[PDB]
Design an enzyme around this catalytic site. Sequence first.
Site, PDB file in Angstrom:
ATOM      1  N   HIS A   1       0.827  -1.200   0.000  1.00 40.87           N
ATOM      2  CA  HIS A   1       0.000   0.000   0.000  1.00 40.87           C
ATOM      3  C   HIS A   1       0.866   1.257   0.000  1.00 40.87           C
ATOM      4  O   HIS A   1       0.573   2.222  -0.704  1.00 40.87           O
ATOM      5  CB  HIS A   1      -0.928   0.007   1.216  1.00 40.87           C
ATOM      6  CG  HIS A   1      -1.935   1.115   1.195  1.00 40.87           C
ATOM      7  ND1 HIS A   1      -2.037   2.056   2.198  1.00 40.87           N
ATOM      8  CD2 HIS A   1      -2.884   1.432   0.285  1.00 40.87           C
ATOM      9  CE1 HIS A   1      -3.010   2.902   1.906  1.00 40.87           C
ATOM     10  NE2 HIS A   1      -3.540   2.546   0.750  1.00 40.87           N
ATOM     11  N   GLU A   2       1.932   1.235   0.795  1.00 40.08           N
ATOM     12  CA  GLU A   2       2.838   2.373   0.886  1.00 40.08           C
ATOM     13  C   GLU A   2       3.656   2.522  -0.393  1.00 40.08           C
ATOM     14  O   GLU A   2       3.834   3.629  -0.903  1.00 40.08           O
ATOM     15  CB  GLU A   2       3.774   2.213   2.087  1.00 40.08           C
ATOM     16  CG  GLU A   2       4.579   0.925   2.063  1.00 40.08           C
ATOM     17  CD  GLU A   2       5.935   1.096   1.404  1.00 40.08           C
ATOM     18  OE1 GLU A   2       6.233   2.217   0.944  1.00 40.08           O
ATOM     19  OE2 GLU A   2       6.697   0.108   1.349  1.00 40.08           O
TER      20      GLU A   2
ATOM     21  N   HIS B   1       1.594   4.122  -3.305  1.00 37.15           N
ATOM     22  CA  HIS B   1       1.412   5.569  -3.262  1.00 37.15           C
ATOM     23  C   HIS B   1       2.668   6.289  -3.745  1.00 37.15           C
ATOM     24  O   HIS B   1       2.605   7.434  -4.194  1.00 37.15           O
ATOM     25  CB  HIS B   1       1.066   6.019  -1.843  1.00 37.15           C
ATOM     26  CG  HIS B   1      -0.296   5.585  -1.392  1.00 37.15           C
ATOM     27  ND1 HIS B   1      -1.348   5.390  -2.261  1.00 37.15           N
ATOM     28  CD2 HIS B   1      -0.772   5.307  -0.157  1.00 37.15           C
ATOM     29  CE1 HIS B   1      -2.415   5.012  -1.578  1.00 37.15           C
ATOM     30  NE2 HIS B   1      -2.091   4.954  -0.299  1.00 37.15           N
TER      31      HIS B   1
ATOM     32  N   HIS C   1      -5.478   6.914  -3.912  1.00 36.98           N
ATOM     33  CA  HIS C   1      -5.727   6.675  -2.495  1.00 36.98           C
ATOM     34  C   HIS C   1      -7.122   6.094  -2.281  1.00 36.98           C
ATOM     35  O   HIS C   1      -7.823   6.467  -1.341  1.00 36.98           O
ATOM     36  CB  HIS C   1      -5.576   7.973  -1.702  1.00 36.98           C
ATOM     37  CG  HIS C   1      -4.866   7.795  -0.395  1.00 36.98           C
ATOM     38  ND1 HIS C   1      -4.352   8.849   0.331  1.00 36.98           N
ATOM     39  CD2 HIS C   1      -4.589   6.678   0.319  1.00 36.98           C
ATOM     40  CE1 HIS C   1      -3.787   8.387   1.433  1.00 36.98           C
ATOM     41  NE2 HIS C   1      -3.918   7.073   1.448  1.00 36.98           N
TER      42      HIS C   1
HETATM   43 CO   LIG Z   1      -2.574   4.900   1.721  1.00 37.41          CO
END
Ligand SMILES: [Co+2]
Length: 152
Positions: free
Chosen positions: A107-108, A111, A117
């Site tokens: 997830h990190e 981004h 998001h």
């Molecule tokens: Co996020």
Amino acid sequence: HYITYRINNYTPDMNREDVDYAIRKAFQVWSNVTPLKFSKINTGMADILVVFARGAHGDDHAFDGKGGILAHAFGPGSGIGGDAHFDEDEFWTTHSGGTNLFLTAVHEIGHSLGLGHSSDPKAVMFPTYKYVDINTFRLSADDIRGIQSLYG
Ligand SMILES: [Co+2]
């Protein structure tokens, strides 16, 4: 263009073996659907950075403890562009435990590549903390095309 990654973070309450594969796999689950390349540099960080800190790291972007922003990496770019931020005071765990080191790493890292998001509700890209079985741990939802195509 060429891509390069570099990891160097190990928090307590979790074996260094879990974190190693956790992030290491984050590049696969993502690259699985991306024109990018692979280049594991042993020495010499690049546009993609990965480090864990606790709140205010002197001149960083403090987040919070267990519950708040477990980890949020800003968009890509120069220097900061593509930097990972993992809360130290937080509570990391396996694919089963709460804070999924694997899922989170995906997830990190997303981004800090070209993800928004949210994308989809069912998708694992949604801004939330959930633990999924590492056995089936892999990209899903329409987002899979939003990373390989990259349009908007
Ligand atoms: Co996020």
